[PDB]
Amino acid sequence: AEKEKNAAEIRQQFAMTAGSPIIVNDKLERYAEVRTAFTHPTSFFKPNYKGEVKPWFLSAYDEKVRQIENGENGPKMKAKNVGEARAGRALEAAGWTLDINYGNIYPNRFFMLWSGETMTNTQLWAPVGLDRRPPDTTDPVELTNYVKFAARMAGADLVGVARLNRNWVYSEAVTIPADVPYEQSLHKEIEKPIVFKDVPLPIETDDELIIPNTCENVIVAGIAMNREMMQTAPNSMACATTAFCYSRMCMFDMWLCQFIRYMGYYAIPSCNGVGQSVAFAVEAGLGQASRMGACITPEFGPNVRLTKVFTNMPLVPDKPIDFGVTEFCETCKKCARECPSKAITEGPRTFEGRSIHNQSGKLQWQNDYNKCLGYWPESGGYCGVCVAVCPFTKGNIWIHDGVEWLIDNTRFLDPLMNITEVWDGKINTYGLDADHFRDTVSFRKDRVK
Amino acid sequence: NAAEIRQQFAMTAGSPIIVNDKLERYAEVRTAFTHPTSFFKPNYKGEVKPWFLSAYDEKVRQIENGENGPKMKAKNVGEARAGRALEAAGWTLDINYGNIYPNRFFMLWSGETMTNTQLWAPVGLDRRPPDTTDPVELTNYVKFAARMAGADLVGVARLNRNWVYSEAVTIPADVPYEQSLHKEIEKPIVFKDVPLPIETDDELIIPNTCENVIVAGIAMNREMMQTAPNSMACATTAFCYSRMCMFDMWLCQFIRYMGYYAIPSCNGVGQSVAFAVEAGLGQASRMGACITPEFGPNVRLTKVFTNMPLVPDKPIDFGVTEFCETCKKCARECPSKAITEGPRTFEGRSIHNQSGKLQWQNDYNKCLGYWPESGGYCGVCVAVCPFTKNITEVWDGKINTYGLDADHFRDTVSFRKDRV
Numbered sequence: 126a127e128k129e130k131n132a133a134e135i136r137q138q139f140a141m142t143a144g145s146p147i148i149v150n151d152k153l154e155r156y157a158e159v160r161t162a163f164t165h166p167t168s169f170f171k172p173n174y175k176g177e178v179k180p181w182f183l184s185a186y187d188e189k190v191r192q193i194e195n196g197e198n199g200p201k202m203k204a205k206n207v208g209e210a211r212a213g214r215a216l217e218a219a220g221w222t223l224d225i226n227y228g229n230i231y232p233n234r235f236f237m238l239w240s241g242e243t244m245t246n247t248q249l250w251a252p253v254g255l256d257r258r259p260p261d262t263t264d265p266v267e268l269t270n271y272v273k274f275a276a277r278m279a280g281a282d283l284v285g286v287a288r289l290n291r292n293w294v295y296s297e298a299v300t301i302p303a304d305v306p307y308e309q310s311l312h313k314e315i316e317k318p319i320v321f322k323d324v325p326l327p328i329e330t331d332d333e334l335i336i337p338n339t340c341e342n343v344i345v346a347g348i349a350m351n352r353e354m355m356q357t358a359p360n361s362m363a364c365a366t367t368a369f370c371y372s373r374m375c376m377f378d379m380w381l382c383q384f385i386r387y388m389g390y391y392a393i394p395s396c397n398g399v400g401q402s403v404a405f406a407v408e409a410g411l412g413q414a415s416r417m418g419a420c421i422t423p424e425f426g427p428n429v430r431l432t433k434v435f436t437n438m439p440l441v442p443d444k445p446i447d448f449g450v451t452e453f454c455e456t457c458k459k460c461a462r463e464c465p466s467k468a469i470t471e472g473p474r475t476f477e478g479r480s481i482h483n484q485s486g487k488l489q490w491q492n493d494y495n496k497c498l499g500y501w502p503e504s505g506g507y508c509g510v511c512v513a514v515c516p517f518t519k520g521n522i523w524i525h526d527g528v529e530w531l532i533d534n535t536r537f538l539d540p541l542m543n544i545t546e547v548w549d550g551k552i553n554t555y556g557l558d559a560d561h562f563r564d565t566v567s568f569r570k571d572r573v574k
Numbered sequence: 575n576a577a578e579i580r581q582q583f584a585m586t587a588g589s590p591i592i593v594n595d596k597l598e599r600y601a602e603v604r605t606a607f608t609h610p611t612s613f614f615k616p617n618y619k620g621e622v623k624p625w626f627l628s629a630y631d632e633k634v635r636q637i638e639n640g641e642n643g644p645k646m647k648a649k650n651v652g653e654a655r656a657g658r659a660l661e662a663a664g665w666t667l668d669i670n671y672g673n674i675y676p677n678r679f680f681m682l683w684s685g686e687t688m689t690n691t692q693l694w695a696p697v698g699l700d701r702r703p704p705d706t707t708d709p710v711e712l713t714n715y716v717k718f719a720a721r722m723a724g725a726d727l728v729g730v731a732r733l734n735r736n737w738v739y740s741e742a743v744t745i746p747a748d749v750p751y752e753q754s755l756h757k758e759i760e761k762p763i764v765f766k767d768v769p770l771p772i773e774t775d776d777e778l779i780i781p782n783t784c785e786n787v788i789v790a791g792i793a794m795n796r797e798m799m800q801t802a803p804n805s806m807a808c809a810t811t812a813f814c815y816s817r818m819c820m821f822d823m824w825l826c827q828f829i830r831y832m833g834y835y836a837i838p839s840c841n842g843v844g845q846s847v848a849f850a851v852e853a854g855l856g857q858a859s860r861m862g863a864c865i866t867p868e869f870g871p872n873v874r875l876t877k878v879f880t881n882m883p884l885v886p887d888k889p890i891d892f893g894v895t896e897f898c899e900t901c902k903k904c905a906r907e908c909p910s911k912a913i914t915e916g917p918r919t920f921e922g923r924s925i926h927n928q929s930g931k932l933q934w935q936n937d938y939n940k941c942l943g944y945w946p947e948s949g950g951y952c953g954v955c956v957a958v959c960p961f962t963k964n965i966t967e968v969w970d971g972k973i974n975t976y977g978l979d980a981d982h983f984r985d986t987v988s989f990r991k992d993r994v
C-alpha cells in the first residue's frame with residue numbers, strides 16, 4: 126500500500142554532514158548590491174512596446190496598461206474580457222501593499238528597521254521592558270525551538286538556521302539617505318557599505334551600515350507561493366502570488382525581529398536586501414541551488430520565496446540537505462529550454478560569472494540576468510516560467526519504494542508521455558493548499574535535534 | 575465537508591438579529607476598554623492605572639516569578655519570558671490594541687497616500703472606472719482576494735447602520751503616535767451624499783452609496799487558546815490582530831484597484847459580531863461571540879465597507895441558540911462571573927451593552943477587571959466552549975504556518991460554487 130508522504134522523513138534521509146555546501150575559489154569577493162540587474166545602470170533601462178527607453182519597471186507598467194485595454198492577461202494571452210484582465214492586475218498591485226519599491230531592499234528604512242526602538246509596537250510595550258531586559262535563555266537548543274515556533278506563527282512555511290557566511294552579505298547596499306521622504310526615494314538611491322565591527326548593536330552612521338561582529342547566525346524562512354497561480358507564468362496571476370508573498374515576507378521579518386528583540390537579543394530584517402537569500406537558504410538546509418539559480422526545496426521546489434533575519438541569538442545550525450537536485454539539473458534543462466529570453470545556460474557549472482550581475486568565485490550555473498530582466502517589460506510581469514516548468518514545482522514528485530524516499534524520474538521526461546479557471550478554482554488561506562499543508566507540520570523533534 | 579454543512583444550514587434572507595423600537599447606534603467610547611468608568615484598574619500593588627498598564631505590571635511580576643499566568647508556574651523564567659515575548663511581538667502590525675482609530679495609521683479610508691499606491695500610480699488602477707459591475711463576478715473576485723489576504727472565512731452582507739458606531743474613538747490627525755493614548759477623542763460617524771469616504775474636522779463621513787460590508791474570519795490556534803488565561807492564549811490573539819490589519823489593507827487596495835472605494839476597520843467603526851452574523855459566518859452565542867461551524871468562537875473578526883456591487887450571503891442557523899440555551903459552560907467557567915446564565919433580553923446590563931437587540935447580556939466591566947489580575951486577555955470562555963473543539967507541551971508540540979492546523983485546513987478550501 127501507499128506510504129503516506131512524510132516530509133520530515135525525507136529531510137532526515139537527505140541530511141548532509143555539517144559544512145557550507147557552496148564550493149568557492151580564490152576570486153570570490155563580496156558583491157555590491159548595485160550590480161543586480163534591477164539596479165545596475167547597464168540593465169536598469171529597457172524599451173517599452175513603443176520603443177521608448179525607460180526604467181524597466183515603467184516600461185513594464187506601459188505593457189500592463191496595454192494588456193488591460195486589450196483584454197489580455199499576459200503577452201498575446203487573451204483574457205475572458207477586460208474586467209478579468211483588470212482584476213488580475215488589481216490583485217497583483219494589491220499584493221505589494223506591505224513592500225517598499227519591489228523588495229524592501231533599503232536597510233534600516235521603512236519596514237526594515239535595524240532597531241525596534243522607534244516602532245509603534247515597541248513604544249506601546251515599553252513599560253514591560255522586554256527589549257531592555259537581559260536574556261533569560263542562553264541555551265541555543267531551547268532558543269532554536271522558541272525561535273522556530275515563532276517563525277511558523279509569523280508565516281514561514283519553512284525555517285532553517287545557519288552560521289552567517291559573510292561572503293553572501295552585500296559589500297555595499299542600495300539605500301536612500303535618512304532624510305529623503307518616500308516620494309523621492311526612487312530618484313535618490315545611493316550605495317552604502319555594509320561593514321562588520323566590534324560594536325554592541327547594529328547601527329547606521331552617515332558613512333556605513335555596521336553589523337556587530339557578534340552577529341553569528343542567520344534565520345532563513347521559506348514563504349510558499351501558490352501552485353495554480355504560478356503555473357500561469359508569465360501571465361498576471363503568477364505576478365499576484367509573487368506580490369502577496371513579498372508582503373508576507375515583510376510581516377515575517379518584522380514579527381520575528383520583534384520576538385528576538387523581546388527575548389533580549391538584536392535582530393536585523395532584510396527581505397530582498399542585505400545579502401543573497403539563495404546562498405543563505407542552501408547553507409541553512411532549506412534546499413539546494415539549481416540550474417535556474419533558485420533554491421529548490423523538497424516541499425515546494427523553487428516555487429517558494431525567501432527572506433532572512435540576522436541575529437546574535439545563540440542557535441543550533443541546521444544541516445544542509447542533498448536530495449539529488451544537482452544531478453537532476455545536470456540532465457533536465459527544462460527551464461533553459463522554456464525560458465522566453467534564453468537567459469538560463471544549458472552548459473556546466475563554472476566559477477566564472479557570465480556578466481557583472483553574477484558573483485564570480487562560487488560554483489554555480491551562470492545565467493544572463495540582463496536577458497531575464499529584458500523579458501519583464503515585454504511580458505508586463507515578473508515572468509516565472511522557469512519556476513512554473515520545473516518538475517520540482519509539481520506537488521507530485523516523491524515516492525517511497527518500501528525502503529526509502531526517491532524522486533520519480535517520470536516527471537522529468539521531456540516531452541511528458543487558463544486564468545478564468547484559476548479565478549473560479551481552488552483556493553485557501555494565503556493561497557496555501559490543504560492537500561499538501563501537512564508537509565509543513567512541525568514538532569520539537571524537527572525544530573531542534 | 576464544510577461547504578455541504580454551510581449550505582445545509584442556510585437561512586432565508588433577512589437579518590436574524592431581533593431588534594425593538596428602542597435600538598439606537600452605540601457610541602464606541604462606551605466599550606469597557608475606553609469608558610471612564612472601566613478604564614482605570616488597580617495593579618497587584620494597589621496602584622490605580624490605565625487597565626493595560628496594570629496588566630503590564632502583572633506580566634513583569636509573572637516573568638520575575640517564573641509564571642505563565644496567574645498561579646501558573648512556568649517551566650522556568652526563560653519559558654515565562656518567551657511567552658510574553660511572543661505575545662508582544664504578535665501585535666507588531668496593530669495600533670494601541672485593535673486599530674480602532676478610523677483613517678489613522680494602517681486604517682486609512684483612502685489609498686492615495688500609501689506607498690504602494692504611489693509606486694503603482696502610473697498604471698492608474700485606482701483612477702480607472704470599474705471594468706466589472708456584475709455583482710456575481712465581483713463577489714467571486716473579492717472572495718478569492720480575501721483568501722489570498724489571509725481570511726479563513728469570508729462573507730458579504732448589506733451594511734446595517736445599526737451596528738456602526740454612532741461616534742468613533744480616534745485622535746486628531748496631526749497628533750503623533752507617542753501622544754495618541756493621551757489625546758483620544760470622540761468623533762461622529764455619519765452618512766451623507768458624497769462621492770468618496772472623507773473625514774472633516776468635525777465628522778467621519780461614509781457615503782450613502784456604501785452598500786456592503788465584507789466580513790473576514792481569522793482563525794486562532796486551538797492548542798494556544800486552550801492555555802487561557804495564560805500567555806500563549808495572549809500570543810495567538812495578538813498574532814491574529816496583525817493578520818487582521820494585513821487583511822484589511824490588502825483587500826482595501828484590491829477593491830480600490832478594481833475602481834471602487836473601501837473602508838478598513840479591524841476593531842473600529844462598528845460591531846464585528848453583528849456584521850459576522852448578518853454575513854453568515856456564524857451565530858451569536860451566550861458568551862457574546864460569533865460562533866462559526868469551522869472554529870466555534872476561536873476565530874477573530876475584521877471587516878471592510880465598500881460600494882462594490884456584491885451578492886449578500888445567507889445567514890446560517892446550525893442550532894447555536896438552542897445549544898447555548900442549555901449549555902452555560904462558559905458562564906460557569908468564567909473567572910469573573912461576567913457571562914449570564916439567564917435568558918436573552920433587549921435591555922443591557924450596563925453602559926457597555928447596546929440595548930434594543932435580543933442577546934445574552936453580559937457584564938463586560940467584570941470581564942475587563944480580570945485582565946489586569948491575570949496579566950492577559952483571558953479567553954477562558956472561548957477555550958471551554960464545545961464548539962471550539964501545559965504551555966511547555968505547546969512550545970514543544972504541533973505547529974504549522976500562521977498557527978493553522980493541517981488536520982482541519984481542508985474545511986476552508988473554496989471553489990467558485992461556494993463563493994457565489
Ligand SMILES: Oc1cc(Cl)c(Cl)cc1Cl
Binds near residue numbers: 507
Ligand atoms: O524581486 C522583484 C523585484 C522587482 Cl523590482 C520586481 Cl518589480 C519584482 C520582483 Cl519579483
Ligand SMILES: Oc1cc(Cl)c(Cl)cc1Cl
Binds near residue numbers: 607626672811951
Ligand atoms: O481586543 C483587545 C483590546 C485590547 Cl485594549 C487588548 Cl490589550 C487586547 C485585546 Cl484582545
Ligand code: SF4
Binds near residue numbers: 415417453458511
Ligand atoms: S527545470 Fe530542470 S534543470 Fe531547471 S531548475 Fe528545475 S530540475 Fe533543474
Ligand code: SF4
Binds near residue numbers: 463496498511512
Ligand atoms: S523568470 Fe522567465 S525570463 Fe527569467 S530566467 Fe526564468 S524563464 Fe527565463
Ligand code: SF4
Binds near residue numbers: 941955
Ligand atoms: S474573557 Fe474570561 S473573564 Fe471575559 S467573559 Fe470570557 S471567561 Fe469571562
Ligand code: SF4
Binds near residue numbers: 860861897899901960
Ligand atoms: S460554552 Fe456553551 S453556552 Fe457558552 S457560548 Fe459555548 S455553547 Fe454557548
